[PDB]
């Protein structure tokens, strides 16, 4: 029979977004594991050879009670065997189908466990973009287990994500529109419908016609049944908000009264049961000492108004001319300043200048965006003896000055 490192492979548990997953059983003890199989040739045929490396390096360091643990990964001349935790409960999707809906007493607990897993990912700069009841597994004691990352990705500082991925449902409006997104707010949107599916037993946005389905999602209009109380209803409307800036965050959800009730204190980092260590708790519980508040006793060093109207900061620089004219303009602007640069995109330059005083190289990233209708915006981003932040500002200043 088929043996892979003391484990006998069995029936296919299913096929994920990338790879075949089949149960394994220990030859000596009968211990069950789940083995995802990745074909090295199909990995190298695509440009995902470096994408798999990242996922392995990140899934191996994960240790959350509600995320499928990775035990080890075996390497063969043709295939990769990722041996990971097995759970016999099956999908959550099949659970919502067995029962009619889910009792809010139990639905809340499952939602608390899921969101705990999501938050852990976001704190490790990982965004799981394929959140769905089919990807939430159950064990013998009804504990949620997030799995099948595949479409997941990392989050860099000052970087947006492009890929439109995931199921047609459960997908944020920005994802189905092919727009740039931050990451975390997308997962919250999937958790919103998951909760809806958990409570209602159906989907908030559903249609046989796919173009009509996208219309409903972008519209952000869904039916809220009367058996859903006032409290939980306000939470769903917050999580499924179309405009990602108005959409709730995990901190928002954690402050919601429907979410706080019957909430175990071991699930979240700053809850009493979660926790040098003593030093951080002293510093963390001093929020007003490390972070600013938002609109008592006026701070002694508060400045009076100079009353003149306060000036408003804006993102980079703008224009109302042709996109080609702007790029043609910024190109001749780099000539007068002697800038060396590589072209990544028709609207994405990676420029670089050598500092004549320190000798160090100063590089930054340029990106032209589209605002409103007849508007454009040039974005300035920094790239990692004097001072790097000053180098970035001085380099930007010279380019802005010699640019109309």
């Amino acid at each position: 029979r088929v043996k892979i490192g003391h484990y006998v492979l069995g029936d296919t548990l299913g096929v994920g977004t990338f790879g075949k997953v089949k149960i394994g059983e220990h030859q000596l003890t009968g211990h069950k594991v789940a083995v995802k199989i990745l074909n090295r040739q199909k990995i190298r045929s695509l440009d995902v050879v470096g994408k798999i490396k990242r996922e392995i390096q990140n899934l191996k360091l994960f240790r959350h009670p509600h995320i499928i643990k990775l035990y080890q990964v075996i390497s063969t001349p043709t295939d990769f065997f990722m041996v990971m935790e097995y759970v016999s409960g099956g999908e959550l999707f099949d659970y919502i189908c067995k029962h009619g809906r889910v009792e809010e007493m139990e639905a809340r607990r499952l939602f608390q466990q899921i969101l705990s897993a999501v938050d852990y990912c976001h704190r490790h700069m990982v965004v799981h973009r394929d959140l769905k009841p089919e990807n939430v597994l159950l064990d013998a004691h009804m504990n949620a287990k997030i799995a099948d990352f595949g479409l997941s990705n990392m989050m860099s500082d000052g970087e947006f994500l492009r890929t439109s991925c995931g199921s047609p449902n459960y997908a944020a409006p920005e994802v189905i529109s092919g727009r740039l997104y931050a990451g975390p707010e997308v997962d919250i949107w999937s958790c919103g419908v998951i909760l809806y599916a958990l409570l209602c037993g159906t989907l908030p946005f559903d249609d046989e016609h796919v173009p009509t389905l996208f219309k409903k999602i972008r519209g952000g209009v869904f039916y809220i049944p009367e058996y859903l109380n006032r409290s939980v209803a306000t939470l769903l409307m917050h999580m499924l908000q179309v405009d990602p800036l108005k959409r709730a965050t995990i901190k928002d959800i954690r402050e919601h009264e429907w979410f706080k009730q019957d909430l175990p204190s071991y699930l979240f980092p700053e809850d009493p049961s979660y926790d040098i260590i003593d030093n951080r708790r002293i510093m963390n519980q001093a929020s007003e000492f490390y972070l600013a508040s938002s609109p008592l006793k006026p701070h002694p060093e508060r400045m009076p108004p100079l009353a003149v109207k306060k000036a408003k900061w804006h993102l980079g620089i703008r224009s109302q001319s042709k996109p080609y004219d702007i790029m043609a303009e910024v190109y001749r602007a780099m000539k007068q300043l002697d800038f060396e640069w590589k072209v990544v995109n028709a609207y994405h330059l990676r420029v670089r200048r050598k500092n004549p005083v320190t000798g160090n190289y100063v590089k930054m990233s340029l990106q032209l965006y589209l605002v409103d209708n007849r508007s454009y915006l040039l974005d300035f981003k920094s790239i990692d003896l004097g001072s790097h932040t000053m180098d970035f500002f001085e380099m930007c200043a010279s380019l802005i000055t010699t640019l109309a």
Partner: protein
């Protein structure tokens, strides 16, 4: 040191013959369409060939070799870097003068345009979004002086510097 031998073709019964079996027939296990067998092979080259429904055959999508007599068998090269995951992912893997996506709404959240409540140190700011970092924000030029600003990260802290620079 396991090695996977998978038969993707059709058949009711598939056997595996190679130098390891002294060219004897090893019964393969069937799933739905897959006939596979995992063996323990040392480093080097190994000649193998399948046996399907009473007929010798090989995998077309695999390296083959002729033994000067017409017999054609497959070739697999078990390397030492095939048994380490990251060593396997490694082997599997300007200055021109030239020659628009919708602006993401997160970048419109200017951190210097929001009040912080007259109760804390005026130097304090809210915790920034990781996606707005390294981006340049500026003021309108007034009387020859340009003011630039950006939020950068040091360790787990964040600093929003402002540069008043006359042009």
């Amino acid at each position: 040191r396991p090695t996977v031998f998978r038969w993707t073709g059709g058949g009711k019964e598939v056997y595996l013959s190679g130098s390891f079996n002294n060219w004897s027939k090893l019964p393969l296990t069937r799933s739905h369409n897959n006939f596979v067998a995992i063996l323990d092979l040392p480093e080097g080259e190994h000649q193998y060939k399948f046996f399907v429904d009473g007929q010798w055959t090989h995998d077309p999508s695999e390296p083959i070799v002729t033994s000067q007599l017409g017999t054609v068998n497959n070739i697999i090269q078990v390397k030492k870097t095939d048994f380490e995951v990251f060593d396997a992912l490694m082997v599997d893997s300007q200055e021109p003068y030239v020659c628009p996506p919708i602006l993401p709404p997160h970048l419109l959240q200017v951190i210097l345009n929001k009040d912080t409540g007259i109760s804390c140190d005026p130097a304090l700011l809210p915790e920034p979004n990781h996606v707005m970092l390294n981006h340049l924000y500026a003021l309108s030029i007034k009387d020859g002086v340009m003011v630039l600003s950006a939020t950068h990260r040091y360790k787990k802290k964040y600093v929003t510097t402002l540069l008043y620079k006359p042009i």
